[PDB]
Paper text:
Prochlorococcus marinus MIT 9313, a typical Cyanobacteria, contains an ABC-type transporter, UrtABCDE, which may account for the transport of urea. UrtABCDE consists of three parts: a substrate-binding protein (UrtA) located in the periplasm, two hydrophobic transmembrane domains (UrtB and UrtC), and two hydrophilic nucleotide-binding domains (UrtD and UrtE). It consists of two domains, an N-terminal domain (NTD) and a C-terminal domain (CTD), linked by a hinge region.
The crystal of UrtA/urea complex belongs to the P21 space group and was solved to 1.60 Å. The structure of UrtA/urea complex shows that each asymmetric unit contains one UrtA molecule. The electron density map of the UrtA/urea complex structure shows that a single urea molecule is tightly bound to the hinge region between the two domains, interacting mainly with the residues in the hinge. Compared to the other three types of UTs, UrtA exhibits a strong urea binding affinity, with a Kd of 141.3 ± 11.2 nM. The six hydrogen bonds formed between urea and Ser122, Gln144, Tyr190, and Asn246 constituted a stable binding plane. In the UrtA/urea structure, the binding pocket was present in a closed state, and no entrance was found. Thus, we proposed that apo UrtA without binding urea contains a urea entrance and will undergo a similar closing process as other cluster B-Ⅱ proteins. Consistent with other cluster B-Ⅱ proteins, the conformational change of UrtA without urea is like a “Venus Flytrap”. These results suggested that UrtA undergoes a similar process to the typical cluster B-Ⅱ proteins, in which a urea molecule enters the binding site through the entrance aside the hinge region and causes apo UrtA to close around the urea molecule.
Residue numbers in the entry: 37 to 431
Write the structure that this text describes.
Amino acid sequence: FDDTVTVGILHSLSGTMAISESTLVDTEKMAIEEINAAGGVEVDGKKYKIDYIVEDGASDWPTFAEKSKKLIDQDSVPVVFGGWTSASRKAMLPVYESKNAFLYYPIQYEGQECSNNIFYTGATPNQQSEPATKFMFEKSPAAGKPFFLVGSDYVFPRTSNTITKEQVKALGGKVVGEDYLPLGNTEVAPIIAKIKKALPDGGVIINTLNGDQNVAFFKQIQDAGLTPENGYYVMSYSIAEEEISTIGPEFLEGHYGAWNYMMSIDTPASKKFASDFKAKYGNDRQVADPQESAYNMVYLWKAAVEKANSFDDDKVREALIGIEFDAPQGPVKVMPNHHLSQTVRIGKITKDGQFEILEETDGPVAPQAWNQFEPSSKGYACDWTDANKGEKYKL
Ligand SMILES: [Ca+2]
Ligand SMILES: [Ca+2]
Ligand SMILES: [Ca+2]
Ligand SMILES: [Ca+2]
């Protein structure tokens, strides 16, 4: 190596979100180690080793904003890989925008955003909850049954459920419940009683709980008899193979997810991701969509740097649009709206905590940041390649 570049990593390693975010740091570090082993990042004929600073967001959104300022100003990083909850991202967004910096954010979310200073590898709703909703209503064993929505009390679950309510109405179904718990809250018995009352003949439960309150939720719904055997099916948007392995797959068997990457994808690229992750971190370790999303961020950033011949975040962000990567999920591409074109999978959870893949799109789906079911965003798009279009413009 001729020089070094130091990037920022900002995730919850402690608190209620650690169950989800800790493995993202592991995965981002694996990508960095791979890139370094292959020669680093090439800029102006010089090979740069990638170093990193990890900051603990501690499941606390003001801390995410504070550590973002530290990484940008004190540490002079050219990108921060970070975030999970939309609460943490909304807290960080003014920091990256006011400092004209660059956050790369990997987690599935609600859309309704298109920051010039954020790029996104997590699913937008049309890459996750919209196909999942149609699947539950039309194809699942609870086809035609009513929907009950349960999530954490912040902007992702509330916005996701607003979209779901619009879509279920358009599909001709019914929503019979919508309830939120504060993030981390484990007092799930009252909502369980409501689900039993509202779905006396079984049905679909849409779960947007984030973090480790999912542990209490899945264990208590099983003890209450809200089980696939009794006609109750949960579709979850914010947990996958990692959290399932901590919870215990016996509590998730038979329930559903919708994701762009699943560990069970039967391709050399998917198997190599899993095998490499186990070799570095242990044979017990899972890979999953959040990790695949974060992995991709590092490789996409590296490609954009080499295309731009610069680490400057304005030049890298300009170069990043259009970049393609042969990812563990299949081919992905960074779009003019800064999001990622991705293949969509529907899965049913097995006794071992893997997904049985039941549906898969014919190639990747372009991300709709501005949601096309929600009346306020219908007809809008985002395109940062055209000065006359931009963050939010009418088609
Ligand atoms: Ca920890
Ligand atoms: Ca993704
Ligand atoms: Ca199959
Ligand atoms: Ca858009």
